[PDB]
Symmetry: C3
Subunit: 114 residues, 3 copies
């Protein structure tokens, strides 16, 4: 799985250990080994949410499977909780786009997962 957060929160406000916390929490949430979890945080972005430049985040979670109605509700609670606690971003200023990827459409290690 791959989780990306783009945010206008400044770099210095991203706490040490945030990438490792995201890795462990997403490994637990997706049921996949941490070795497969990729995380990417992009601070200092020029972005607005609802016309406002107060703290916000635009995010995506891609996974081969483990994506669906109830699962995505759970991921949204988990990830909004982490963004609120660690980055001080209100959950109503976060969007997360979820992508269920087919194995043939994910390259890795000179091939794909197909």
């Amino acid at each position: 799985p791959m989780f990306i957060v783009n945010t206008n929160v400044p770099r210095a406000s991203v706490p040490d250990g945030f990438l490792s916390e995201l890795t462990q929490q997403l490994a637990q949430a997706t049921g996949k080994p941490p070795q497969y979890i990729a995380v990417h945080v992009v601070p200092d972005q020029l972005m607005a949410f609802g016309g406002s430049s107060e703290p916000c985040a635009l995010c995506s979670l891609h996974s081969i499977g483990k994506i669906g109605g109830a699962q995505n509700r759970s991921y949204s609670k988990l990830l909004c909780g982490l963004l609120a606690e660690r980055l001080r971003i209100s959950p109503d200023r976060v969007y997360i786009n979820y992508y269920d990827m087919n194995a043939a459409n994910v390259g890795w290690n000179n091939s794909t997962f197909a």
Copy 2:
């Protein structure tokens, strides 16, 4: 709806007010209120189009519905027009990927829109 633009145009060439103009015009174009619109501009990027480093842009528009052939032609005219007028990017050096998101695959405020 969520609109992202990545461009090699420098930050100082992004005019004041641009995020608000994008918010307003996308609200009108999609039929969703400004409150739902997120916009994200990423200047100073290392990118080429057709092998050339002349000004260019790679963009995304994500929406739950309101995506389709005629609508996407209209969005492209609107958004290429804005990028040409405000960022001086030729419309033939812009790509915009459109994504019709399922409500269950969009998270916000601790849940999803399903």
Copy 3:
């Protein structure tokens, strides 16, 4: 086609010629004219892969057609090879998401490719 690479490798470690090589090799691999190839490299990113912040890359290839099982395996060998040779990223620390875009869902030059 459009290829994006996000990496924690620093900007100074991206060699001169990288975007040009990606453009030429992707034109060759996809069979599309280089005039239609867009490339984008984003170094200096805060990211981790599998619990490690050693060099890694999260990438996307979007194309109208030219996407499929065998084609994506070939692209992954080509692109992981380039990332290893030029950026010193191990191929097992690379993810590439492939997207077969409908022509009506790609804006360009004030319209779509439909």
